[PDB]
Amino acid sequence: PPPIADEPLTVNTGIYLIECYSLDDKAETFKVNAFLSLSWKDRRLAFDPVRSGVRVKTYEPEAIWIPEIRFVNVENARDADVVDISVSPDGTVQYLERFSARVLSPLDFRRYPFDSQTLHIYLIVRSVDTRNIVLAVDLEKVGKNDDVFLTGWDIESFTAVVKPANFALEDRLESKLDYQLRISRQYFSYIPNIILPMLFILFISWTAFWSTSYEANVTLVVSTLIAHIAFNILVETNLAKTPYMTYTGAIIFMIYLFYFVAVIEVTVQHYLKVESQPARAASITRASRIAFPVVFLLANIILAFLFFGF
Amino acid sequence: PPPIADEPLTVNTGIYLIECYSLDDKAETFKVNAFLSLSWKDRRLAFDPVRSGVRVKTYEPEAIWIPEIRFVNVENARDADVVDISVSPDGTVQYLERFSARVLSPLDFRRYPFDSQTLHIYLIVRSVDTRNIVLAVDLEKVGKNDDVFLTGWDIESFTAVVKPANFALEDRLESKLDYQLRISRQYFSYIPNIILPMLFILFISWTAFWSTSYEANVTLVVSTLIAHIAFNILVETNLAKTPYMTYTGAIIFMIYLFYFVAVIEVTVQHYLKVESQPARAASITRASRIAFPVVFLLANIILAFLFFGF
Amino acid sequence: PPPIADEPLTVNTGIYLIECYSLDDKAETFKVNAFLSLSWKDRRLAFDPVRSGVRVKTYEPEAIWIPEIRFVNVENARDADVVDISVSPDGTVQYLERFSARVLSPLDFRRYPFDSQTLHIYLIVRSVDTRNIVLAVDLEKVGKNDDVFLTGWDIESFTAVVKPANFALEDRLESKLDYQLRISRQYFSYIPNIILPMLFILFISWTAFWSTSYEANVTLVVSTLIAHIAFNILVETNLAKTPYMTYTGAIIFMIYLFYFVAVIEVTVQHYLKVESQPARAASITRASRIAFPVVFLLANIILAFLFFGF
Amino acid sequence: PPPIADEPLTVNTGIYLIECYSLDDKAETFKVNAFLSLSWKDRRLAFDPVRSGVRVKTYEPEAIWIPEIRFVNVENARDADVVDISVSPDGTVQYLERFSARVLSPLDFRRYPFDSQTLHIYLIVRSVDTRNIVLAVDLEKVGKNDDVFLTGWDIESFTAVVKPANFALEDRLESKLDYQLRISRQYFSYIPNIILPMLFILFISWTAFWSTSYEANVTLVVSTLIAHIAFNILVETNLAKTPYMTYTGAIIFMIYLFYFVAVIEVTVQHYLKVESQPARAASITRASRIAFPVVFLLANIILAFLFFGF
Amino acid sequence: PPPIADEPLTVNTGIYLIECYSLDDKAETFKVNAFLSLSWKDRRLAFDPVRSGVRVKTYEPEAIWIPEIRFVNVENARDADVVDISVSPDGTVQYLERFSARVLSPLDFRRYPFDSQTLHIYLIVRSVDTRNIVLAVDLEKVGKNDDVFLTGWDIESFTAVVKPANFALEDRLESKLDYQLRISRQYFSYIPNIILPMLFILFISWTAFWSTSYEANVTLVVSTLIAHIAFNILVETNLAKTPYMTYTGAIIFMIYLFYFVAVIEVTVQHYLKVESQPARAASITRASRIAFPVVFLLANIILAFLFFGF
């Protein structure tokens, strides 16, 4: 029994985030526990203030006609509990539920260690014999609480795109809204556990540029290559199979080349010295001591600029 | 109370994919959130346009007789919410739910890094005292949305096999349809994380073909063999126990042989040189420098052609 | 309201497997999605063909008395949806649900890489004031579909033990049936990923029988021992803590001994040669080159026969 | 509507284990699927055999007043299905459900490889205006079935503490029972996968007591230390963070010391021999060959006795 | 139908913890199973002791008006079962449910191995046409049981902040309470499995300060660096991505520097000795034997004080 009306019915939405948690980088999903605030005019049950009852009349969801508001980018059916329905004397309904769903929003990993994200929450409503249009009442839109806790993320701002996008879908039009949660990753943990350890073993790796023993250099450069494969796997594990190149995935692949040409050096250093050309051997080795660090710091500047500076 | 009819009743199906996600390569399952569109003629409740009501009459699932449409290759009971039922004046019912199930479709891993898949969604319906036949209404079949996001996969096309397959099952006939989602894997992530790293350590592995120290060569060839076992496990983990040979599983097993005959070489190089036959030692070693790379690039051409080119 | 009868009521069961999946070797459980077919005579609602209605009368589960059929070796309550109830004119009820439960069937890992299993599905029914006995109707027992897909397993045959086992349990008798799914493991994946890699590193391990350098031999035999611990863990992970000895668990423990006596050799080879007895040193070492491979191939024949040939 | 009585009402409990599974050592929880048998006298509905009906009258849970029996040490709400309610003519009710919950019982890991456990199942009932007391009817208490399968555990005995413990809790008294499942761990799997492999690498570790090469000894003692860290982690993973010392955790920490003083030896052996005191070097080394094995076998006897023998 | 009142209604809360478990350090969540005790005066149903019935009248949740008490920092909807409702003659309602939810409370990992935590449980209630205020009845607040078992944690005290915090939220005021569970981590497990093993491999690492062989020192210092990366990962795994520095994360990063300057030493020791300056070589090496242990024990005192002593 939809409210008889002369033109499209406006449903007034508003989300109040109470809890955020479990941002799954692999799955590209997060979990929200918030308030949903719906309000529409249904003159069909305007009541008479003085003639009976009180200021506002409370109802159960069964009596009133309620607009079916579905979340779009959500895995299962939104898990909600009705908190209060309050009809105003003019026939204005005040709906308020508390829902908990896990939302499916894509993430951009192009700068995975240092990146910002804009999570999306989408609300749609379908029509029957009257048209429905959703819109945000900003006073119920202040989704954030001063206690929102998203582990490993900094919460910038929860806002809503005021203008809905109205599709036509299966000989009926629907109205979609875009609630946007903007977050930036807390990169600090990565430095003392990934970045700095990865560099250290790379620096050790070419300590063999001040050595002449092949056995001790192959032990050196190779054992550090193993340690880098460990970090490479440790990072590739908590990250989805992106079709592009991540920032750490670039530098982690760059490092792979510095272990190859280092292995190439100590090998070339060896055949050369064993072939009675040590004048060339100790000449190459000495250059490496400058070339490898410089090209590295150079390529990183090239790489870093190619991602962040552009 | 099934609709009394003169011949088999046609139910007109149509799926509209809203979300795709969680393609589990190990489990061989994906998760879909879509629209189901059913439509059948039930003249038993044709209504009179002018005489009463309006153009279209809305019902609750309890009143009308609804065809029981079950998904075949699905784990648990399909999780659906009814969106709208709309009976046309001639007695045509327009059913529309929004379901979310996880579907069980086999995958072909013969070319695991670079492969295409055709996922299946099957709909069946059973008969009672009249026969039922399903068929697709292509206007409700445009399953795709311009936002379908399947991580690590490119979505080619969602179509439906228009001709149903009608089995006889337990003294009653059923009608089955085949909705087909065609996808191709986003292989790019595999190159800088598996393929290229795997090759590098293999090339380093036979840098010992330019060396004479057994100790430094056994350190070399063996330490790289360990690193390959790591990658071998890393790949065997995100992949089911296929009864055939995967493409990477072939090349990853081929690599295992190149580490064996390399270990064989440095060993043969050593007994030989220690046995006062260095004329043969440095002769073998020099050939290896050409044989191993050539046979590898050859075997890969042989292997690659044996999988993709045929 | 159980059907008044003169003697024990026979309920006629029948399972039709639609999907099989998720055989958890660690948990010793699998997941089935099948049809349950129950049929019993309840003369208490025999209806009159000509006098009224039609050939067969359809009911809702609430009206009719339905026998409570419970699955025995199942974790939670079987998750079923009723498909159709059809009472025959003589008072014969045709019940048909579609259930999905995860079943708990023990597995025998004595030949873990190459083994066959017989999964069990048990149905019980309890009595009230009349006795109930279950029995299989073979035309509804053809559980298999030509699409049953059990990853990493070959499905041999789904049959049912026709004779029920009738216990007495808590001053009431119950009737139990045994549906049996016979499967054999798809061993092919194990060879290029476990068996063959494990052997290779073992053969490399005693390439040190053609060498005299202690440093290069301890690097050899020990580094391969590490790689074997990796495979040992990799296999012990996807396998339950059986109280017996598995086939691979035997050969994987046998391999552990060949790494010990090899380490013993190179060590004995060394003290000996360092003690100015190289006549004995190079004598032992040369025998190893034959003893180790022969004893291995011998012990495997002994072991293999002890498991499969007996 | 509780049964009006003159004194505390006795509810007669009884559990019949049908399935046991999923004993999580990390979580300290197991999962049970059993029968619950309740029986109490409610004279308020004692009925007339001859005057009407039959021997026993069957009811639905809604009609009768049922005692609210809650499980104590259980995570979520016990998941039960009612099997039969049968009121005896005197007003004696025979209740029988089939439940499936996961129970939270602490475990004692003091002898983790070889240990016995007593799992607990607790039933409580709260009072209203009459007092309730639970008690076991041993004829319904034979919880075990000849098919109970607890992977990696031997089931000794399922019994019940007949005398309930009656607390006062929030101005109302409750009655608690103690059902006890006694189990002993199947230790066999641990020997060929943890214990024996751990010892082997320790014995190899001090094969360097028959060697003079520092490079080959540091390769020896250290590479085996790495393998022990692997086993140390492999065991610490499937085990909770106990506040006491486990048996394997003791011997695994003892082994850590034997790798330290071994590294200390080869180091002391070296400075000494390099310092032109080989008379002392080869004297220490020779003693190690006896000291380390003896102290080990001694400390193990000391340790083993300190845990099991006391 | 809220109770008509002259001023804000006081609801009297009280939590009785029955089970605590599953404190997820990664997720920063724990799981509680407790009693909720609500009590408010609803004179609108005061009954007449003498005139009818008995001392206390028992109701079903449907009849009475019940205050909607929601948990704040909880993932999904609190899972509760009503135990008893008992209205007093003056119109005082005694509500008691048993709930089980998983709570989301932030943890402070600044001293991760040795740390104390204060878990939070928050209760809110919203107003309608009368105001509601929650407050604790300490006789129902004794949340603890003498059986509360939180694995790997010591439970200090469960208390409640008696003064509620009353926000205004969306043109309606809410009343929030703070129940506080104070716990301290059981650090003992960490010493024999992380701390002591980590130190041992570090001490072994600079046993190369009593050695002159580069090959044996690079084997030494590097192989132990690998073992430390293992522990570093083993610890970083069971710990969230904090934006600050943990205590073990500091010392584990400090250790990384001691492996770098040690690798720097043996390298400098080598170029020097190879450059015919052994007078400086054996001079540096001898100082290291004192510098490294002292600076370590010093830096730890500095670090430890910087975290705990301040």
Residue numbers in the entry:
A (entry chain B), B (entry chain A), C (entry chain E), D (entry chain D), E (entry chain C): 7 to 316
What does the paper say about this structure?
During activation of a pentameric ligand-gated ion channel (pLGIC), the binding of agonists promotes the opening of a selective ion conduction pore at a distance of more than 50 Å away from the binding sites. Each subunit consists of a predominantly β-stranded extracellular domain and an α-helical transmembrane pore, which interact via an extended interface. Whereas ELIC forms a cation-selective channel with high conductance that is activated with high efficacy by the primary amines cysteamine, propylamine, and GABA, the cation-selective GLIC is activated by protons and inhibited by bulky positively charged compounds that also act as open channel blockers of the nAChR. Our study has identified a cluster of interacting residues located at the β1-β2 turn, the β6-β7 loop and the pre-M1 region of the extracellular domain, and the M2-M3 loop of the pore that exert a strong influence on channel function.
At the tip of the GLIC β1-β2 turn, immediately adjacent to Asp31, Lys32 interacts with a strictly conserved proline in the M2-M3 loop (Pro254 in ELIC and Pro246 in GLIC). We thus suspected that this interaction might play an important role for the relay of conformational changes from the extracellular domain to the pore. Mutations of the conserved proline in the M2-M3 loop to alanine (P246A in GLIC and P254A in ELIC) resulted in channels that, apart from a small shift in the EC50 in the case of GLIC, show robust activation with similar properties as WT. In line with the comparably small effect in functional experiments, the crystal structure of the GLIC mutant P246A is virtually identical to WT. Contrary to our previous expectation, conformational changes appear not to be predominantly transduced via an interaction of the tip of the β1-β2 turn to a conserved proline in the M2-M3 loop of the pore domain (Pro254 in ELIC and Pro246 in GLIC), as mutations of this residue to alanine and glycine still permit channel activation. Critical interactions involve residues of the M2-M3 loop, the pre-M1 region and the β1-β2 turn that all contact the β6-β7 loop, whereas a direct interaction between the β1-β2 turn and the M2-M3 loop appears expendable.
